[PDB]
Design an enzyme around this catalytic site. Structure first.
Site, mmCIF file in Angstrom:
data_model
loop_
_atom_site.group_PDB
_atom_site.id
_atom_site.type_symbol
_atom_site.label_atom_id
_atom_site.label_comp_id
_atom_site.label_asym_id
_atom_site.label_seq_id
_atom_site.Cartn_x
_atom_site.Cartn_y
_atom_site.Cartn_z
ATOM 1 N N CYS A 171 -7.453 3.219 -0.838
ATOM 2 C CA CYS A 171 -8.531 4.193 -0.698
ATOM 3 C C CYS A 171 -9.571 3.921 -1.778
ATOM 4 O O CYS A 171 -9.295 3.226 -2.765
ATOM 5 C CB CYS A 171 -8.004 5.627 -0.823
ATOM 6 S SG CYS A 171 -6.755 6.109 0.398
ATOM 7 N N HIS B 232 -2.377 2.528 -3.910
ATOM 8 C CA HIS B 232 -3.297 3.655 -3.897
ATOM 9 C C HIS B 232 -4.557 3.208 -4.619
ATOM 10 O O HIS B 232 -4.534 2.218 -5.352
ATOM 11 C CB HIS B 232 -2.694 4.871 -4.610
ATOM 12 C CG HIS B 232 -1.882 5.758 -3.717
ATOM 13 N ND1 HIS B 232 -2.376 6.292 -2.546
ATOM 14 C CD2 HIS B 232 -0.607 6.204 -3.825
ATOM 15 C CE1 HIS B 232 -1.440 7.024 -1.969
ATOM 16 N NE2 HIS B 232 -0.357 6.989 -2.725
#
Ligand SMILES: *C(=O)[C@H](CC(=O)O)NC(=O)c1ccc(CNC(=O)c2ccc(Nc3cnc4ccccc4n3)cc2)nc1
Ligand SMILES: *C(=O)[C@H](CC(=O)O)NC(=O)c1ccc(CNC(=O)c2ccc(Nc3cnc4ccccc4n3)cc2)nc1
Lengths: 175, 88, 88, 175
Positions: free
Chosen positions: D163, D115
């Site tokens: 991301c 992430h």
């Protein structure tokens, strides 16, 4: 005999054969170049030489002369802005992204020449107590598709002459 | 009809040094990076795309003297080669 | 005898999206960026330098669908072309 | 008939003629490749799938499989590390930069899959209240000439699947 008296000056020309060879060696992976007769190419130079608190960037005029002429040689109309705060730079960048000529252009060059710290480019009013910084991130946001749809799908070259900290950028090694 | 577009695309930044580091400047000759970039553009604009040219400028700085710096290409979203085609 | 070397050189970062933006992922197929990179490496490692390959991955993302992303090359200090020469 | 049963698997081979053509088309502007018989190429994959607070990265195992095999096909010995804090990642990166094999290698690949927020890559213990972030800046510092002299003058490829914020990355335009 090639001649620098022409509009391209000291920039070496691309022959008609060279242009055809490149258009073959690389496929549809080249950015499209707009018709020379009708294209309105734009470039912007923001240079800061005189600063309130930080030392004067002696020689910056030689940089302006060279960069202005080079972008012109390459076909761009060059806007030269001097001694601007980070606020002025933002305003000027916004004004640049709003120029109608980008509609009938194929590319753009942005040139920033100033003092600089780790976080970004220095405005004229920069000091340690009161920072005057334009972030590289900010330049990008202002020229991106949201804020500059006219430059959608078009190369945007950003050039920065500035320090990025105080270090000499070197380490010693023995042979 | 409306269509989607990438918010950020077709960008290339070229800085005069790597993060944390200084860029050098001569009082009568200008900036070392700027001068080198003009030289390389003048020579290579006709044969190389701008990414290649930036590498050559970098390569030209490969051997460090007393005033060393290493120009950096940043935030590249070029999907194509950008040839300047000087003269056209 | 000691000699000077650039503190930072011969780097290339390749991110899955541009700053501020998401990167997409399939529960059984993996990450869209990773899958695309493996495809392009497999096909182009033998003919292109890694910078070229990264551009081709980018180009392959040029047309956005419902899950759009634009991979970004960052902090490039490569002074040379890096060819993998697979098989050698 | 080309075959994926070999060590390069699904990676298309570079013929002896192709290698000679590239060594001619581009001059001494290619990174030197070390003798195959004696080179100790290293690669590192740090992948985070299970997280304390943030949702599980379903499919990450397919990414590990593919990347591990690809770097191997290209000639690298692949170290796979899983579910690490930003602190663990730093420790592991430091350990990687201290591997003796870099001395007898010509290049390295670093792969981070996790992430991510605007500021960097997420460790397993990441939450909004207590961030667990590794900055891209930090990766570079650890692999640079100061902290990794063995990789001086050698390509270091860093690949990040993450991301970089919450936005879909798109703007609407009409034809
Ligand atoms: C940091 O923010 C700024 C960045 C900037 O203003 O661009 N950097 C400085 O503040 C800065 C301070 C001091 C110096 C000192 N310069 C030199 O040491 C120097 C010595 C020799 C030369 N020689 C030289 C020879 N030939 C050329 C040709 C073309 C261009 C330049 C050139 N230079 C240069 C500089 N520099 C920067
Ligand atoms: C943000 O930090 C993370 C980054 C990461 O974990 O890598 N992103 C996410 O948290 C994230 C949340 C949700 C989703 C939802 N994914 C999709 O919408 C999606 C739909 C279709 C496909 N299809 C597809 C088809 N073929 C392939 C081939 C190879 C690889 C992938 C692939 N995908 C994918 C994803 N994503 C990310």
């Amino acid at each position: 005999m090639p001649t620098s008296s022409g509009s391209e000056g000291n920039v070496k020309l691309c022959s008609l054969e060279e242009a055809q060879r490149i258009w073959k060696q690389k496929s549809a992976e080249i950015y499209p170049i707009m018709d020379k007769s009708s294209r309105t190419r734009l470039a912007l130079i923001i240079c800061n030489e005189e600063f309130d608190s930080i030392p004067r960037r002696t020689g910056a005029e030689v940089d302006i002369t060279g960069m202005t002429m080079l972008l012109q040689n390459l076909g761009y109309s060059v806007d030269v802005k001097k001694n601007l705060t980070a606020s002025d730079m933002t305003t000027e960048l916004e004004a640049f992204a709003h120029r109608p000529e980008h509609k009938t252009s194929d590319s753009t060059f942005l040139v920033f020449m100033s003092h600089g710290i780790r976080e970004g480019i220095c405005g004229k009013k920069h000091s340690e107590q009161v920072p005057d910084i334009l972030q590289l991130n900010a330049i990008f946001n202002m020229l991106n598709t949201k804020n500059c749809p006219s430059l959608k799908d078009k190369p945007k070259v950003i050039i920065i002459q500035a320090c990025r900290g105080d270090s000499p950028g070197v380490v010693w090694f023995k042979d | 009809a409306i269509k989607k577009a990438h918010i950020e695309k077709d960008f290339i930044a070229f800085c005069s040094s790597t993060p944390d580091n200084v860029s050098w400047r001569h009082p009568t000759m200008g900036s070392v990076f700027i001068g080198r970039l003009i030289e390389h553009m003048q020579e290579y604009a006709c044969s190389c795309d701008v990414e290649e040219i930036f590498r050559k400028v970098r390569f030209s700085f490969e051997q460090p003297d007393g005033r060393a710096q290493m120009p950096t290409t940043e935030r590249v979203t070029l999907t194509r080669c950008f040839y300047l085609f000087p003269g056209h």
